[PDB]
Each structure stands twice: as structure tokens, then as C-alpha cells.
Structure 1
């Protein structure tokens, strides 16, 4: 159960990741989360990352590969893991292959969550996130039970700093450039599976379960 999720900004990676972790019991590894946590702490790594993240640009490959290698070296990853939003360049994918070869933990599937690009702006601009647990809601498509607060813990919802229209436009341009080469990389390795992310959340997850329920040790 060594799984990677890829998809354009807003496609539903984090929404699916939360459900995969709950169902299958493997740790969530999100480069986005790691960077934003480091930003909040204002560490040298965080202060370096912030410059890129704020513009909607990719953080350099070197630092990014480093933090993922470090995370994967932790004991919990022995049972599997769910990488969310990494790799997102071919150089990251190549380094990952080598790391996982050394570790003896090769990827089972790369799940590509496909959503029409024309949908992604509204996905992001309408997104609200729990400040306590980080789960995501959508004011139109997936609202909380009580406006402004999280169903699970009562935490206050907020809007991610990079979810403004101008930053979203950039984030979409940057990552769309990467789509064809990464798809070509993993289609080659015969681990790529496409899922239709343009469905109700539980229906996208139904399709994810078809794939992940098939895995046997």
C-alpha cells in the first residue's frame, strides 16, 4: 500500500487522501502540509519555501526531495504511505524511484484524479479549511454542518492564503506544464491509474476503493 496521488490544484487530492488514510491505515505525506507548517513556524526552510508558495510556483526539487526522503525514513512508512502532491516534476519522480528502490518500498499505484480545468477555480475559491485538523469543505459543493466551523472538532474554518484568484491562475499554469511528462513517466512504469474526480466525493472515493481494495500483501 505505497500510493501516490497526483492531480491539478483543486482536483480533490486532499479530500481523497483523508478518506484513503481513514479506510486503509497508512500515513498521509503531503509536501503542501509540510511546507505550510514550516512557513507558520518561520524556519529557514519555511522562509525559503514561502517565496515560491506565495507566488503559486513550485518549491525547488532539491529541498522538496529532501523533506520527503526524511519523512519516508520514519518507522510508520514501513506499512505503506499515501504521498499527496509529490512527486510533481519528473526529477522528483526519478529521485523517488531511487529512494524507494533503496528502501525496498516501490510504488503500487499512482492515482491521477482528473477534473476539467474549467472547474478548478471555483473549487479553490469556494474552499474553506479547518484551522485545527486541516479538513476541507466547500461553500457550494461540500459545506460544513454549521457555517464557519468544522464538523469534527468545532475548529474555525479559514481560506488558504494561496486560494486567491491571482495565485490560483498561476498555480494552474505551473502544474499543467507538468501533467503530460509525469503521466508519461508513470504510464511507462505501469503503475498509473486514472480516476474521474468530477463526481460526488463519495463516488470518486468508490472508484479509489476499487483500485486500493484490490491490493493484497
Structure 2
């Protein structure tokens, strides 16, 4: 089960991925999460990536591809993996092709979670994340039972630094111009799957799960 999750900022990659990992147990590989973890530990990678992430810009291809290549080679990817937020440029897609060719783990499906750009600002500014487990909530669409705290572990929730109007706008701008070329790239390969992401979380996952049967 080799999967790629793609979608505009806030479309629900992390939300849907959390459901996939629970049902199948494949590693959830999010480049965004990897960069932020690096930013927290203040590693050289983290500091370099921060400049781009804080502005809502894409981190350069070379360094991004490098960390994904190493990640996909780990033992936990033996039965499959879930890429989240990578690739997000045709160049990264072409690089991944070579990487998976080397590992002998070609992509089964590229799942595009389609959501109108006009509703994503609301999805992100209203997002609140658990500082302990990283699961996401939304003040309106999926609120925690007790405001400010995680339903699972009681951890304090926060708002990601880049989820402000200005940066969200840049993120949408930067990723929107990369969207059609990526869709065309995978449509040509014959394994692009489009899912309507503008429905309730479990309804979206129902369609996502419909694509996962028979992948080992």
C-alpha cells in the first residue's frame, strides 16, 4: 500500500491520513510535520526550512527530496507508506519516481482531496492543534469537547504559526499554481484518484477507504 495524499492547504490531508494509519498501520510521512519537528529541535535542516515555512513558501526541492528519500528507506515502510504533502511540484514528483524505482515501491494511488480554495482560509484560521499528539481540531467543524484541550491526552491546543491570514494566503497562492501540473502528471500515469473533500470527515474517509481494498 504505497500512497500519496495531495490537496490544497487545509484540505484535510492530516485528518484523512490519521484515519488511514489507524486502519492499515503504514507510516504517515508528512514533510510539513518533518520540517516542524526539525524546527523544534533546532537542527540545521529546521533552521533552513523555517525561513520558507514561516512565509508560506515552498522549501527548496533538493533538500526536501533528500529527507524523503532517506525516510522512505526505513524498515517501517516495508509494507507500504503514506506520503502527505509530498510531492507538491512536478520536479519532486519526478524525483520520487526515481526514488521508488530504486526501492521497488511504486505508487498505488495518488489521492487528491479536492476542496474549493474559497473555504480553506476558514479551515486553517479555525484550526487548533494538540501540542502533545498533533491531531487537529476546528473551532467550528470539529471542536474539542473541552475548549483548548485535546480529547485524547488532555494536552493544550495551539494555532500553527503559519495559520494566519497573510501566510495562509501565500500558501494557497504557491500551492495552487503547482496543482494542475501535478494532477496532469499523475492522471497520465493512470493512478490519480479524486475525492470530494467538502463533506463530513467520515464521509470523505469512506470514499478514501473505498480505494484502499486489495493493496495487501
Could you state the TM-score of these two structures normalised by the residue count of structure 1?
0.98
Distance in 1 between residues matched to 2:133 and 2:41, nearest whole Å:
17
Residue 39 of structure 1 corresponds to 39
Q: Matches of 1:104 and 1:73 in 2, distance apart? A: 11
Task: Give the distance between the partners of 2:144 and 2:35, measured in 1 at CA.
Answer: 26
**Corresponding residue of 2:80:** 80
Structure 1 191/147 Cα, relative in aligned 2: closer, same or farther at 3 Å?
A: same
Deviations 1:99-144 (A, max 9, x none): 1011010000000000011100000000000000000000000000
Residues 142-178 of structure 1: CA distance to partner in whole angstroms, max 9, x if unpaired? Answer: 0001111001111100000000000000000000000
SS of alignment partner, residue 212 of structure 2: helix
Match of 1:14 in 2: 14
Q: How far apart are residue 41 of structure 1 and its match?
A: 1.3
- CA–CA separation in structure 1 for the residues paired with 2:128 and 2:8: 18
Q: Distance in 1 between matches of 2:128 and 2:215?
A: 36
Match of 1:182 in 2: 182
Q: Describe how 1:1-217 pairs up with structure 2 within 5 A.
A: 1-213=1-213, 215-217=214-216
SS in 1 for 2:210: helix
- Residue 216 of structure 1 deviates from its aligned partner by 3.8
Whole-Å separation in 1 of the counterparts to 2:117 and 2:164: 16
Tell me, in whole angstroms, the C-alpha distance in 2 between the residues paired with 1:86 and 1:118: 23
- Cα RMSD over matched residues? 0.6
Indicate the SS of the match to 2:211: helix
> CA separation in 2, counterparts of 1:216 and 1:161?
37
What's the CA shift for 1:211?
Answer: 0.5
User: For 1:76 and 1:37, how far apart are their aligned partners in 2?
Assistant: 19
Q: In structure 2, how many angstroms separate the alpha carbons of the residues matched to 1:123 and 1:5?
A: 18
Tell me how far 1:10 sits from its aligned partner.
0.6
CA distance in 2: counterparts of 1:172 and 1:212, whole angstroms = 28
Matched position secondary structure for 1:211: coil
Q: C-alpha distance in 2, partners of 1:84/1:151?
A: 24
**2 CA distance for matches of 1:104 and 1:86?**
18
Q: For residue 86 of structure 1, report the CA deviation from its aligned partner.
A: 0.3
SS of the residue aligned with 1:79?
coil
* 1:81-112: CA deviation from partner (whole Å, max 9, x where unpaired): 00000000001000101110110100000000
Segments of 4+ moved more than 4 angstroms: none
Unaligned runs of 5+ in 2: none
